[PDB]
Amino acid sequence: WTATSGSCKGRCFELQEVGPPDCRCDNLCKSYSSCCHDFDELCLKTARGWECTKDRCGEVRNEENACHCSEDCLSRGDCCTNYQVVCKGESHWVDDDCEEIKVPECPAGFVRPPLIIFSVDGFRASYMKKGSKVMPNIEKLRSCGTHAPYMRPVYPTKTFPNLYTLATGLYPESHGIVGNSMYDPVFDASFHLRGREKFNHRWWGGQPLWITATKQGVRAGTFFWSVSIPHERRILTILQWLSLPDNERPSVYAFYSEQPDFSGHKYGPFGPEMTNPLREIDKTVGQLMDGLKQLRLHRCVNVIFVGDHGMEDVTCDRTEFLSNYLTNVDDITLVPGTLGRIRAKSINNSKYDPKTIIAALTCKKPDQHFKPYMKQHLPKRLHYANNRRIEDIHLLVDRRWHVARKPLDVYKKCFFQGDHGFDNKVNSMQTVFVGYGPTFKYRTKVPPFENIELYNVMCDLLGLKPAPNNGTHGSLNHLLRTNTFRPTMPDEVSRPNYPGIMYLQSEFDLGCTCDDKVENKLEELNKRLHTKGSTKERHLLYGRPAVLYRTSYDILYHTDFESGYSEIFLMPLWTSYTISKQAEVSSIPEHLTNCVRPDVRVSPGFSQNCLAYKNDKQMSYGFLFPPYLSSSPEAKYDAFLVTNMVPMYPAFKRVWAYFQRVLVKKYASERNGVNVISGPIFDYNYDGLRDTEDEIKQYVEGSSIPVPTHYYSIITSCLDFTQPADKCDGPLSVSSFILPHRPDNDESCNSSEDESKWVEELMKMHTARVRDIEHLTGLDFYRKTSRSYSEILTLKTYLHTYES
Ligand SMILES: *[C@@H]1O[C@H](CO)[C@@H](O[C@@H]2O[C@H](CO)[C@@H](O[C@@H]3O[C@H](CO[C@H]4O[C@H](CO)[C@@H](O)[C@H](O[C@H]5O[C@H](CO)[C@@H](O)[C@H](O)[C@@H]5O[C@H]5O[C@H](CO)[C@@H](O)[C@H](O)[C@@H]5O)[C@@H]4O)[C@@H](O)[C@H](O[C@H]4O[C@H](CO)[C@@H](O)[C@H](O)[C@@H]4O)[C@@H]3O)[C@H](O)[C@H]2NC(C)=O)[C@H](O)[C@H]1NC(C)=O
Ligand SMILES: N#Cc1ccc(/C=C/C(=O)N2CC[C@@H]3CN(C(=O)c4ccc5[nH]nnc5c4)C[C@@H]3CC2)cc1
Ligand SMILES: [Ca+2]
Ligand SMILES: [Ca+2]
Ligand SMILES: [Cl-]
Ligand SMILES: [Zn+2]
Numbered sequence: 001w002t003a004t005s006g007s008c009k010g011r012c013f014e015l016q017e018v019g020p021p022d023c024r025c026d027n028l029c030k031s032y033s034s035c036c037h038d039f040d041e042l043c044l045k046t047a048r049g050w051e052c053t054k055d056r057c058g059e060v061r062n063e064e065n066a067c068h069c070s071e072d073c074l075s076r077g078d079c080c081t082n083y084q085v086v087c088k089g090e091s092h093w094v095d096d097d098c099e100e101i102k103v104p105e106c107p108a109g110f111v112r113p114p115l116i117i118f119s120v121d122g123f124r125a126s127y128m129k130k131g132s133k134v135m136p137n138i139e140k141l142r143s144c145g146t147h148a149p150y151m152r153p154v155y156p157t158k159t160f161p162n163l164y165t166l167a168t169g170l171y172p173e174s175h176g177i178v179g180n181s182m183y184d185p186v187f188d189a190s191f192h193l194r195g196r197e198k199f200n201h202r203w204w205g206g207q208p209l210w211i212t213a214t215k216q217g218v219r220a221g222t223f224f225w226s227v228s229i230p231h232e233r234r235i236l237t238i239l240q241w242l243s244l245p246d247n248e249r250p251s252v253y254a255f256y257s258e259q260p261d262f263s264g265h266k267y268g269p270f271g272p273e274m275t276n277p278l279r280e281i282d283k284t285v286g287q288l289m290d291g292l293k294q295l296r297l298h299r300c301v302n303v304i305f306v307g308d309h310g311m312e313d314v315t316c317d318r319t320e321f322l323s324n325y326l327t328n329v330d331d332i333t334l335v336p337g338t339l340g341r342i343r344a345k346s347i348n349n350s351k352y353d354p355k356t357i358i359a360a361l362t363c364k365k366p367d368q369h370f371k372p373y374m375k376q377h378l379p380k381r382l383h384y385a386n387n388r389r390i391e392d393i394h395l396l397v398d399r400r401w402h403v404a405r406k407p408l409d410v411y412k413k414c415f416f417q418g419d420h421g422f423d424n425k426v427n428s429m430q431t432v433f434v435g436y437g438p439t440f441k442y443r444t445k446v447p448p449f450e451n452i453e454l455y456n457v458m459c460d461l462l463g464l465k466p467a468p469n470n471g472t473h474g475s476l477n478h479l480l481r482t483n484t485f486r487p488t489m490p491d492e493v494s495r496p497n498y499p500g501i502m503y504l505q506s507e508f509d510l511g512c513t514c515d516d517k518v519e520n521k522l523e524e525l526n527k528r529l530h531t532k533g534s535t536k537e538r539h540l541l542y543g544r545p546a547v548l549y550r551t552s553y554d555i556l557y558h559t560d561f562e563s564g565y566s567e568i569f570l571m572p573l574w575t576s577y578t579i580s581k582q583a584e585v586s587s588i589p590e591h592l593t594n595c596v597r598p599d600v601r602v603s604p605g606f607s608q609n610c611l612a613y614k615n616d617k618q619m620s621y622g623f624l625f626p627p628y629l630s631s632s633p634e635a636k637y638d639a640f641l642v643t644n645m646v647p648m649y650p651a652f653k654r655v656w657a658y659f660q661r662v663l664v665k666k667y668a669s670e671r672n673g674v675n676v677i678s679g680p681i682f683d684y685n686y687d688g689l690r691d692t693e694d695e696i697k698q699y700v701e702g703s704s705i706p707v708p709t710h711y712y713s714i715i716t717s718c719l720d721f722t723q724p725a726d727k728c729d730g731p732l733s734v735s736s737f738i739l740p741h742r743p744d745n746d747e748s749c750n751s752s753e754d755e756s757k758w759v760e761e762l763m764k765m766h767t768a769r770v771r772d773i774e775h776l777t778g779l780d781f782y783r784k785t786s787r788s789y790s791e792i793l794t795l796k797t798y799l800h801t802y803e804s
Helices: 039-043 083-087 136-144 159-168 209-215 231-241 261-267 272-294 354-361 451-461 522-531 610-615 633-640 650-671 759-765 770-777 789-797
Strands: 115-121 182-184 189-191 252-260 302-307 319-321 332-335 339-344 370-374 393-397 402-404 433-436 553-557 562-566 571-579 620-623 645-648 674-681 710-718 732-740
Touching: 083 272, 115 159, 115 272, 115 451, 136 272, 136 302, 136 433, 159 209, 159 451, 182 332, 209 252, 209 451, 231 252, 231 272, 252 261, 252 272, 261 272, 272 302, 302 451, 354 370, 354 393, 393 402, 571 645, 571 650, 620 650, 645 650, 650 674, 650 710, 650 732, 650 759, 674 770, 710 770, 732 759, 732 770, 770 789
Parallel strands: 115 252, 115 302, 319 402
Antiparallel strands: 182 189, 302 433, 332 339, 339 393, 370 393, 553 562, 562 571, 571 674, 620 645, 674 710, 710 732
16 A cells, blocks of 8 residues: 655655655656656646747746746756757767767766766667668767677676676676576566566666666766656656765766667568658657756766667577477476477476476577577577576577567567667677766777676776676776776696606506607607706796685696696586697697506696596597697697596587687688687586585596586687787787587487588587686686786676677
């Protein structure tokens, strides 16, 4: 119940929120069905439209008007935004030349430049160019401010997960809002667009910008708006708030537009009906920019123009149905659409086997427009697993398609031409970012970045300290004229050992044979020089990675490669090597096929053994530095050391062998030499972070040799590819992957064919940021370069997407 006979007189769009059962007058009172009777009367005036006309100038104030053209209106702070244009012969903001903003130009009492977030729902990245002729305001912002060609949203590319990601800098798995529709098993509750449930605070984790603001004494305007409040009333409300006395005036605001998402759903991303909503958005920006100019704030306020996601062509006839794959189609609940999530209909059912479901859905049709995964096997770049609201079974859907359960679910539950929510690397899902203001840069293009990064910057723009988040603070410093945040490298926690020759062959009982008894003054000091690390500046191009946790490990040098070897995990954490363009591929000679040599630098007790690999028939082994790329037949023996060896399922060796034998060389050719760092990853609990020694869920049978869940590689070269990787003078170029260590290749429906038809396709799907690998390994890369740390942070957040 709400006693709704209180009044809104003098309380229109209040900032503090009065709790039930007193009535409300704030921008969300409508969504709670708890506005005071007079709210519509007092706070939602509409009379006379939104624009001053020639006759309205210096009128006599009429409180019934939606906005005012009267002489006192500048003082009351409630003129129509075009009041100055018509009545005082002023120019629209958009018609004024782009002049640089070297210093904030703020009116007295303004302690800091305010921030306005202008959020546009469904604003697909390609609109900035494709619709530019009809969006002059937005185009002034873009070309005068700082902009990226596009901004990458989070997965799923849905509204709620993305709008709350923006506000927190957190992944959906972390903030809790993993979809527009969710079931929480511990709540036995369901979060949906229609219903009251979504209003409970228990769904919304993390700390959103406005809470972060308040707690640090920066006052915030309320971010969310009720749909029924027209957009023009939203802008004047932000302008009225900006006229408030210094002590009550918030420093951060948000505006939201349902367009163009609303139309895009009806008419597709580029339907001819799309021109108008874009025209309308632009108008609303114009209005805001005019309102700011009236207030002398247009050279004081930082404005962020940002979208939550893009829009793809989707229609009813492009739906795949589960009922065409499953028999037990009524045992399962499917959360449907542009992404699928599956669970049991009742947990009072022990005969629910996810494996059968996964199997029944795998490569079953040659045309198939989705692919099933257990959530932990989803690409690691999506970070879509560590939450109980994310169902074990996930369906990743082809762009342009839908997944539904039964055909009835579509005809009785076509009406739409557009949708979104696909994999966040898909082009049609990309969205926009423009920043304009005194703190942003002038006429500056920046490379594309991820929406998870903006919270840090917004906190910077406001002189706030960000709550712990998934952005990488400093990686967007290149957007800003002036910086609140100087980032610093984390300190190394573990210093390495540098073992020399300490053990004799016969001290080893590993069950590892090699034909190595093939056999100077000149060339016997030289290979010793290599073991002391004389070719280190060649294979370790950016300094050794730092270990950011306490552990026990040794740096091992060789002619061709260098490793940080973990005495705990009994394999290297990292293995670094440069392959120049002219380097040549060779084969494993017939006599060395099964060669594995003991490492005299490392104790038997801290080494693996071939015996275990013999006894485990699920588990074979592979090597981190590839024998195929040895510089010389002598050097090749280095690659067969027990300390270069890592466990690998036969199925995975196929992917790995192809990567090492063919692709490394190909990359070195195209990119003019590459530096490769490769290693194991252990993330059994799929939280995206390194598991500790006591969290290992799987060992090679009858041993203490832990089995990795993933294998990564970081491949780096010179951005200017006229220079060799090992002699780059400036900016670097990187690409990375985190391959899932899986006992089969069921993910690749073409796997029965030659590795040249599927393997690179798997690796592209599993691309990664260096920073994703950092979270997973507890390492810190690029410690020694000639580049600024900011630039290196940017490099570390880069993701190579393989889109056109
Ligand atoms: C991305 O960035 C985020 C934020 O920095 C990182 O997430 C953080 O990771 C650490 C380690 O996993 C977490 O620390 C643990 O914290 C708990 C207590 O946490 C409570 O307080 C904090 C602080 O205000 C809240 O943020 C927490 O909120 C979580 O739970 C609520 C429900 O209560 C939910 O509404 C939120 O969405 C959020 O849930 C998400 O995180 C939790 C993990 O806490 C996870 O279960 C869930 O699936 C969601 O994803 C919470 O109220 C503390 O008890 C722990 O200590 C224990 O472990 C240590 C191990 O050393 C033991 O020594 C000790 O004895 C304890 O047993 C941890 O310290 C931190 O909470 C978490 N923060 C957030 C906001 O998620 C991610 O790791 C980053 N991801 C990547 C890939 O980089
Ligand atoms: N940072 C930040 C920040 C800034 C502003 C804001 C502002 C938030 C805000 O007012 N809204 C966003 C959240 C939802 C969106 N919505 C929908 O009905 C809806 C829209 C598009 C869809 N496509 N497919 N299903 C869809 C469903 C109603 C609701 C109110 C409006 C939120 C966060
Ligand atoms: Ca949206
Ligand atoms: Ca983990
Ligand atoms: Cl296979
Ligand atoms: Zn939408």
